[PDB]
């Protein structure tokens, strides 16, 4: 999805094999907040939310708690107390097009900043002045969104990155999403310290 209109997928009632995401070298960014990246399997949550979007390289730094900027404030904002992991990778060879991939847009103009995880997808022409735009662009009437010129010839700061943020939410609930469990071979006819489920 476009960063102004990020795609939230809800993950629930499943086994979260966080080890795959952690162990692979496919990611350039793996920033965990409030949790340890190697202990993610032991953390049980009610909901895991995967927010999927594309931004340019220079803006990858904005996908974090406490950050400000065009993305952090007008497109995809994370709370200062965000709990979860931000995972991102260079997608230059996936999204960029020779003539420019302009299907990805971000918000430049807004009346105010976004609340954490607020998804504002309005396309109303932004009124910078006191004169109503009435559907017409012009002086002080600007379309709030702009496209990214993603091209295979761009420098890294202007290459697309695919970002997935896994937000970890614990509610007054059973906590249905946990990682895989360890298991060993069964040993018979010997004294062992055992653990069968609980």
């Amino acid at each position, epitope marked *: 999805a476009s960063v102004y209109a990020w795609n939230r997928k809800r993950i629930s009632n499943c086994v979260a094999d966080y080890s795959v995401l952690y162990n692979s070298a496919s990611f350039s960014t793996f920033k965990c907040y409030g949790v340890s990246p190697t202990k993610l399997n032991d953390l049980c949550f009610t909901n895991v939310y995967a927010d999927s979007f594309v931004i340019r390289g220079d803006e990858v730094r904005q996908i974090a708690p406490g950050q400000t900027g065009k993305i952090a404030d007008y497109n995809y904002k994370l709370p200062d107390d965000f709990t979860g992991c931000v995972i991102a990778w260079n997608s230059n060879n996936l999204d960029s097009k020779v003539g420019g991939n302009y299907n990805y847009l971000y918000r430049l103009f*807004r009346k105010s900043n976004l609340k954490p995880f607020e998804r504002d997808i309005s396309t109303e022409i932004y009124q*910078a*002045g006191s*004169t109503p735009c009435n559907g017409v662009e*012009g*002086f*002080n009437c*600007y*379309f709030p969104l*702009q496209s990214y010129g993603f091209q295979p010839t761009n420098g890294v700061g202007y290459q697309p990155y695919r970002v997935v943020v896994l937000s970890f939410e614990l509610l007054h609930a059973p906590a249905t999403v946990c990682g895989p469990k360890k298991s060993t071979n069964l040993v018979k006819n010997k004294c062992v310290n055992f653990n069968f489920n609980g």
Partner: antibody, heavy 120, light 100 residues
Framework: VQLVQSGPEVKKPGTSVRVSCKASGFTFTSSAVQWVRQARGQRLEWVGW????????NYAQKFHERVTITRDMSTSTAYMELSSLRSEDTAVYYC????????????????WGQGTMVTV | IVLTQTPGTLSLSPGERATLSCRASQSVSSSYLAWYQQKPGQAPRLLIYGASSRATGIPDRFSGSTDFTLTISRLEPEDFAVYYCQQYVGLTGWTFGQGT
């Protein structure tokens, strides 16, 4: 709150000139900059403009084909380049912007550069 | 658009009032017309925007209002300048009048 214009230029016919203005004291990135020119003893003519935020441009039809306007937010500067220069392009160039504070902008071009002569 | 600015020259002694006029070649929104004051040798400044509103720093010697006008309630020595109208309707077709 000032828009500071670059110094004068002397160019040959058939070449190009680059002029620029730096914004200071105001929210350049939410603003817009227009470029105009005036020959001595003549009327002020519109050349074109850019929205700083979006980077989108529009031009006067008489210059359109040979004029490009751009910007670089990292230095709060608006730029204009005129190609295929003619002797008739000898004029004082001016730049202007509305005053902006965050997302709130004025309703006209209050901030003007001092004016710079380009000779061809 | 094409804007017509009249009179070509406004000759009037200080202490008196002056009337300036700008004519559109088509019906336009008043919200996009502005008036400028150009003291010779200097960049122009905005006086009136949105046809009727005063710009910051503009004294009550001036006031705003296809036919649009600029009124100078009273002339002081510093109010002798070439006046221009400018139209910003839409993204293109922006222009200035000839200058008073």
């Amino acid at each position: 709150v000032q828009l500071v214009q670059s110094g004068p230029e002397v160019k040959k016919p058939g070449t190009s000139v680059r002029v620029s203005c730096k914004a200071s004291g105001f929210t350049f990135t939410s603003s817009a900059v227009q470029w105009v020119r005036q020959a001595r003893g003549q009327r002020l003519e519109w050349v074109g403009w850019i929205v700083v935020g979006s980077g989108n441009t529009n031009y006067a039809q008489k210059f359109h084909e040979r004029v490009t306007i751009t910007r670089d937010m990292s230095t709060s500067t608006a730029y204009m380049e005129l190609s295929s220069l003619r002797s008739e392009d000898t004029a004082v160039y001016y730049c202007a912007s509305p005053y902006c504070s965050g997302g709130s902008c004025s309703d006209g071009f209050d901030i003007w550069g001092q004016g710079t002569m380009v000779t061809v | 658009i094409v804007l017509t600015q009249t009179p070509g020259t406004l000759s009037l002694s200080p202490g008196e009032r002056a009337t300036l006029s700008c004519r559109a070649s088509q019906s336009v929104s008043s919200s996009y017309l502005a008036w400028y004051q150009q003291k010779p040798g200097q960049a122009p400044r905005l006086l009136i925007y949105g046809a009727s509103s005063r710009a910051t720093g503009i004294p009550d010697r001036f006031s705003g209002s296809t036919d649009f006008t600029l009124t100078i309630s009273r002339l002081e020595p510093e109010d002798f300048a070439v006046y221009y109208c400018q139209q910003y309707v839409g993204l293109t077709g922006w222009t200035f009048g000839q200058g008073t």
